[PDB]
Design a protein around this ligand. Structure first.
Ligand code: NI
Length: 341
């Protein structure tokens, strides 16, 4: 059955709750972003109102064939009324189209649901600054102090310099980037830009990218793999066997692959600096695991919550084990005592 942390009290609303059948007494289903653990259950047969961003609405219409009449896109940073309740969508700094949702309950309670987010100080200057939040439904994916990672900017710098050096030393090297969902587009777009290439990809992936309102996208992407030296492949194919195979398919146009796997976190972060990352190499194939995250680090998440000062926190991630739940609760208490709320 639908867990309590997907229900918004004092409303008929649920968040990211599409895999439970008909939720009893739900009058509107909100979708924070187009990732499969969150949309799981939607299709052309869904007949209840879905509230989301424009971008997420483009993906629902074109990738899952949800019918237009049940898609209710909302503009960002705008007070809107949904079944008699004021709501605002804010940018979550996650993947394209991902939002946080502010609910203003008729009784005066104010609820923020972060969906998935990467907290940023820029959030401290949105419509969040304007009123108090009583309950926070928090993306706790990396809510433990071992999770440190670099900025997105530092990671992209590393990738661009790496790719540019390699191809300039060997103009017959191919660059490959892995993907399994939307998000992380900067990785492959930034590399293609420095190399003067388009990114080549499957028709299905090109279709997905065309739903995202990215400026000048027709100029950065293509389905002609032959004309491209940056190729996008499914994440599963980013291994020595899948890459050797791919290289065969290029018909002696290339003699070396440099591949990138943008992971969330990996334990080399506790020790290693971004400056100090090295690939795994086999023959003429090298694979770089880079820590490009679209979720908050522990320190980013802590700063956000200590700024917001919510009266109650409801975690939405890592809730399935008692040891996880109890450890998170302990962090929340520390943060509250250190900050004085
Ligand atoms: Ni996500």
């Amino acid at each position: 059955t639908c867990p309590f942390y997907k229900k918004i009290p004092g409303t008929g609303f649920t968040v990211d709750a599409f895999q439970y059948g008909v939720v009893e007494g739900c009058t509107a289903y909100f979708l924070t972003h187009f990732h499969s653990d969150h949309y799981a259950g939607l299709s052309k047969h869904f007949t209840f109102p879905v509230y989301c961003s424009e971008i997420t609405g483009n993906l629902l219409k074109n990738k899952l064939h949800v019918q237009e009449q049940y898609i209710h896109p909302l503009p960002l940073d705008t007070e809107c009324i949904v079944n008699g309740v004021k709501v605002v969508l804010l940018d979550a700094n996650h993947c394209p189209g991902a939002v946080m949702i502010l609910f203003y309950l008729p009784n005066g309670t104010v609820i923020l649901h972060t969906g998935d987010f990467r907290a940023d100080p820029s959030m401290e200057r949105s419509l969040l600054a304007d009123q108090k939040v009583h309950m926070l439904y928090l993306d706790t994916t990396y809510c433990s102090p071992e999770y440190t990672f670099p900025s997105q900017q530092e990671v992209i710098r590393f990738a661009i310099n790496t790719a540019f050096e390699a191809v300039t030393l060997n103009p017959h090297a191919l660059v490959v980037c892995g993907t399994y969902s939307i998000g992380k587009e900067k990785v492959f777009l930034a590399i293609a830009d420095v190399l003067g290439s388009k990114v080549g990809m499957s028709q299905e992936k090109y279709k997905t990218l065309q739903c995202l309102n990215i400026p000048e996208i027709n100029s950065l992407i293509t389905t002609d793999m032959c004309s491209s030296l940056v190729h996008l492949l499914p994440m599963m194919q980013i291994n020595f066997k899948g890459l050797q195979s791919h290289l065969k398919k290029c018909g002696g146009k290339y003699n070396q692959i440099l591949a990138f796997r943008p992971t969330g976190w990996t334990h080399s972060n506790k020790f290693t600096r971004i400056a100090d990352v090295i690939p795994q190499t086999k023959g003429n194939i090298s694979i770089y695991g880079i820590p490009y995250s679209e979720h908050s680090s522990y320190l980013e998440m802590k700063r956000f919550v200590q700024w917001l000062k919510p009266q109650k926190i409801i975690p939405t991630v890592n809730v399935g084990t008692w040891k996880s739940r109890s450890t998170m609760e302990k962090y929340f208490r520390e943060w509250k005592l250190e900050a004085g709320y």
